[PDB]
């Protein structure tokens, strides 16, 4: 029932059990009806998580595998648990462009809805892609850039600058930009641009997305401090 | 159990 | 499937805070059968504390919601369902770390310290079996929880000296089960105060007997309020 | 990731 697969995902997220939280919002999506603003919300809330761990644990791993050169037993045991830590990680991306595939992009029928998931879908292509091989890295690089280029163009004309949704956008793809395609110059600017016009119609900003406009804003104008520099 | 890119 | 890789991969899991991993390699540790050494033991207690840690601090919250949720009878059984899934899980953990401390850890224990850490474990895990049992089996699983600590307390008296942070966290952990188990504040306060007491008697020597004795006090602040 | 009575 979804009333009830929507309980426990909120019911899982008090208990900070994310990988429960997923599965019911997995399983709400796999019912195949367009997401109320709040499920949608719960899903990406729940693999936000799942995969963020994820993410930060190979962050750790991979930095001692680094540290470890000369010791090279050592770093083949971290090597190793990097590629347990590495699997999951695809797995959970799998889960999630598949669900946007099959079901959230095709039901996406406002353009609001349609950003988010396309910018959902460049995210985690990007996941992906920090840790794909050779030959499949640089397809998969070209996925979350058309995602996020088509997620930026509808946004561009459907959204307000201040729209968190568009500036969340702003700021992840200039984050592909500078660690993805290693050009801080085209990060910076998309970042700068975005910043700049949320405080020129900072009239339109509303009461409902003040908090989360604000704090992309924040972190887009950190990133362009600490990219500049 | 973590924030991430979003 | 090694012992060195395994206690490295441990480490590693623990750096990542994936406990699960890090306990289930600690698993295979033990069950290659040999005593542990005080750096594979201290692993295995780490790695456990957070895995079941985890679970009964996600009991704690759906058990308040359903707490709060009478009333509103659909939405409390969604919750006490929920709970049941989480408690599965808890029991499971518990069963887990009991059978190795019945089958590996106990028997191989050569030093008392040792013993004593590994009985004050076994009283935890009962502890907390215990507190989402039912009925007749809780009655059952308190006794157990009631006879390693007991078992622990009587030999770290006999042969740890007062300060041992292993004797004093079994102090502070056995007085704590007869305040939150078995509800008897006369008895918890009692043995928090004869430890303590027994410590001081030699903290001229010598930490962290020092943040257990902190412990002990704090415990007796809330409990006498 | 928590800690407990232990």
């Known amino acids: ?229 | 159990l973590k924030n991430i890119r979003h």
């Open chain 1, 1 to 229: 029932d979804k009333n009830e697969l929507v309980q426990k995902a909120k019911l899982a997220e008090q208990a900070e059990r994310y990988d429960d939280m997923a599965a019911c919002m997995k399983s709400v999506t796999e019912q195949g009806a367009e997401l109320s603003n709040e499920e949608r919300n719960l899903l990406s809330v729940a693999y936000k998580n799942v995969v963020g761990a994820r993410r930060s644990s190979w962050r750790v791993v991979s930095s001692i595998e680094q540290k470890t050169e000369g010791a090279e037993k050592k770093q083949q045991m971290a090597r190793e648990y990097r590629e347990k830590i590495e699997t999951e990680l695809r797995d959970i991306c799998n889960d999630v462009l598949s669900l946007l595939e099959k079901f959230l992009i095709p039901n996406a029928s406002q353009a609001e809805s349609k950003v988010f998931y396309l910018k959902m879908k460049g995210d985690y292509y990007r996941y992906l892609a920090e840790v794909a091989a050779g030959d499949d890295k640089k397809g998969i690089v070209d996925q979350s850039q058309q995602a996020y280029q088509e997620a930026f163009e509808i946004s561009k004309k459907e959204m307000q600058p201040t729209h968190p949704i568009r500036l969340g956008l702003a700021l992840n793809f200039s984050v592909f930009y500078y660690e993805i395609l290693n050009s801080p110059e085209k990060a910076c600017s998309l970042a700068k641009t975005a910043f700049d016009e949320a405080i020129a119609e900072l009239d339109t900003l509303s009461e409902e997305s003040y908090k989360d406009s604000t704090l992309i804003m924040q972190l887009l104008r950190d990133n362009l401090t600490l990219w500049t520099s």
